[PDB]
């Protein structure tokens, strides 16, 4: 039944089907003849000659007068640094014209922006105007802004990623997701700075900027003045941006209804900037004039996920976000406040009062949340965990609890928390990797009596930033 064969073949992946071409001359033709059975390629890594034979295989089989076929994923990366250039040259020189790469993941770390741009320009296999998604693990160049010219070159591009592994020396309605990731050690500026402040990206749903270094010479950058450019911005992730501050960010959030809707916010400054309190001061120019409308509510009213790991937010600032109901609660589902040194819980006798978190007020406000992360929150000693124990009645939605890499928390608090939680049916998942004080017999009791469906106790796991899953800070 020669017509239905693609439905059979597509249950099996490209390289494997290509090996299946060798079973017999008949099935070789039966496979080869159906070009749309191919929809992904992984050439990751590949040597030069095998990439030549891949290009050759396209030039033999996919070569067609009909302007039909398109490919949904083309991952390419060189086995060898010099051959990186040869592979990329051949790709943009000899790609068949009638065939459109939908999504190109050109992981070519040695190559520079300038060289990539040139290879598109003088390679002339024009699909790169017409592809849909792009990714470039490449060397940055500070000297020239060719990466902006990639977007100008690639008008159909909806999702772009750049991973500037190294350094060497107007309206963009199409775009939907911009992911900018940098090696903070090698990258010492901000690549898209001019583009982001000058242009608009009005349909931009998600933005993710990590590892960049904000310039000191530009308070418009440091005050997130550019960030006003992007309404409809469903999610913002921003992490290890060394010269940014959450203070300047909250000053933006004070004084504009910048976003009609954020579903998720994630901010993570790296170094400890001074204490930020929620700047609830509503000044009046005169009492004969209006107090300035503070846009914290309507900006943050939409959030499902709030993530502030490492950000030096004070505990009172977060309580004020809840008492003011700027954070909505009825819509919030996941809260990450790990690694925030300016959080203290009510049972602590040692404090400054505005670093206190009133967990009872907070958990009353936003009760329906699923997922809490308090990892690296050293302030969560065993005594402080008592506040969570008595506030168990307010967190009935909570499924996933990360408190890992806490060097204080004894298994006592863990156990009695899960036991009072059991008065709610296990907690779905709990993470205590690296917690040197949880006794192995206690966590084995947790497993044995089945107080948690899954609990992780990899004591030897030194770090928490799983790339892609937990963080987009590079390596």
């Amino acid at each position: 039944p020669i017509e239905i064969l693609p439905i059979i073949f597509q249950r099996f992946t490209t390289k494997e089907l290509v090996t299946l071409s060798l079973v017999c001359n008949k099935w070789r033709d039966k496979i080869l003849y159906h070009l749309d059975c191919f929809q992904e390629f992984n050439l990751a890594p590949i040597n030069f000659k095998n990439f030549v034979k891949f290009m050759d295989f396209l030039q033999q089989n996919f070569t067609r007068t009909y302007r039909k076929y398109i490919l949904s994923q083309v991952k390419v990366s060189s086995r060898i640094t010099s051959e990186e250039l040869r592979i990329t040259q051949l790709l943009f020189s000899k790609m068949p014209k009638c065939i459109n790469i939908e999504r190109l993941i050109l992981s070519m770390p040695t190559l520079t922006t300038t060289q990539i741009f040139k290879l598109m320009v003088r390679g002339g296999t024009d699909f790169f105007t017409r592809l849909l998604e792009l990714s470039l693990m490449i060397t940055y160049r500070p000297d020239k802004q060719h990466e902006l010219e990639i977007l100008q070159t690639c008008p159909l591009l909806k999702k772009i990623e750049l991973i500037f592994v190294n350094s060497l020396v107007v309206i963009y309605s199409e775009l939907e997701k911009i992911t900018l990731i940098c090696d903070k050690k090698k990258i010492k500026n901000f690549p898209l700075c001019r583009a982001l402040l000058r242009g608009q990206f009005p349909l931009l749903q998600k933005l993710t900027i990590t590892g960049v270094t904000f310039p000191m010479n530009n308070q418009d950058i440091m005050n997130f003045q550019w960030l006003l450019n992007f309404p409809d911005l469903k999610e913002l992730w921003i992490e290890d941006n060394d010269n940014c501050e959450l203070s300047k960010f909250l000053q933006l959030l004070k004084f504009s209804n910048v976003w009609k809707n954020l579903e998720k916010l994630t901010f993570r400054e790296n170094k400890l900037y001074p204490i930020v309190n929620l700047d609830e001061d509503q000044p009046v120019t005169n009492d004969d004039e209006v107090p300035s409308m503070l846009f914290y509510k309507e900006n943050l009213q939409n959030l499902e996920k709030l993530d502030l790991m490492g950000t030096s937010i004070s505990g009172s600032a977060l309580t004020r976000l809840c008492e003011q109901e700027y954070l909505d609660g009825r819509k919030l589902r996941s809260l990450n406040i790990g690694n925030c040194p300016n959080i203290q819980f009510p049972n602590n006798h040692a404090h400054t009062a505005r670093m206190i978190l009133d967990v009872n007020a907070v958990l009353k406000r936003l009760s329906k949340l699923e997922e809490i992360n308090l990892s690296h929150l050293s302030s969560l000693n065993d005594s402080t965990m008592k506040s969570f124990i008595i506030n168990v009645p307010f967190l009935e939605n909570l499924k996933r609890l990360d408190i890992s890499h806490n060097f204080e928390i004894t298994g006592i608090s863990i156990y009695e928390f899960l036991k009072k939680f059991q008065m709610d049916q296990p907690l779905a998942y709990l993470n205590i990797d690296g917690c040197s004080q949880v006794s192995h017999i206690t966590v084995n009791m947790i497993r044995a009596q089945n107080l948690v469906t899954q609990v992780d106790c990899v004591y030897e796991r030194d770090v928490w930033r799983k790339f892609g899953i937990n963080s987009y800070s590079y390596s």
Partner: peptide, 21 residues
Amino acid sequence: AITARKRRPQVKLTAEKLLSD
């Protein structure tokens, strides 16, 4: 996506460098 894997950089005398000022 790929977190970093190392490689050894190297330098030698070359015609461009030999043709520099």
